[PDB]
Amino acid sequence: HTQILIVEDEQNLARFLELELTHENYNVDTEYDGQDGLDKALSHYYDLIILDLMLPSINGLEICRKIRQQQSTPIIIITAKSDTYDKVAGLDYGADDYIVKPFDIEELLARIRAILRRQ
């Protein structure tokens, strides 16, 4: 059973993502703080981690780099706002995909599938 960690401080969006991913037979853990999210990722192996760029305590870009120092775990960054520099930084720091809002859940789910195929 595939395990996903969501690190998202916007509780409405965190809840939407959890519900939609659970409906696809994913087991989902959620953290609402950037440091709790980093701590959780480093203490348990997930199949894929979704990070919001804009997180409290430590932002998603910096969480991504710290995870990737220690693990090969797939990472997707999602964000409300971002230009090409932000995207390039996120992918260069270890993200496997980088998605700007608004996005349709069907695209997120397909990109998860595409990443997990190769694991």
Swiss-Prot record:
GO terms for molecular function: phosphorelay response regulator activity; transcription cis-regulatory region binding. GO terms for biological process: regulation of DNA-templated transcription. The keyword Nucleus does not apply. One of its GO terms (cellular component) is cytosol. Residues 3-116 form the Response regulatory domain. The keyword Transcription regulation applies. Keywords: Activator, Cytoplasm, DNA-binding, Phosphoprotein, Repressor, Transcription, Transcription regulation, Two-component regulatory system, Virulence. The modification 4-aspartylphosphate is found at residue 52. It comes from the Bacteria. Phosphorylated by ArlS. It is found in: Cytoplasm. Member of the two-component regulatory system ArlS/ArlR involved in the regulation of adhesion, autolysis, multidrug resistance and virulence. This is Response regulator ArlR. The chain holds residues 2 to 119 of 219 of the full protein.
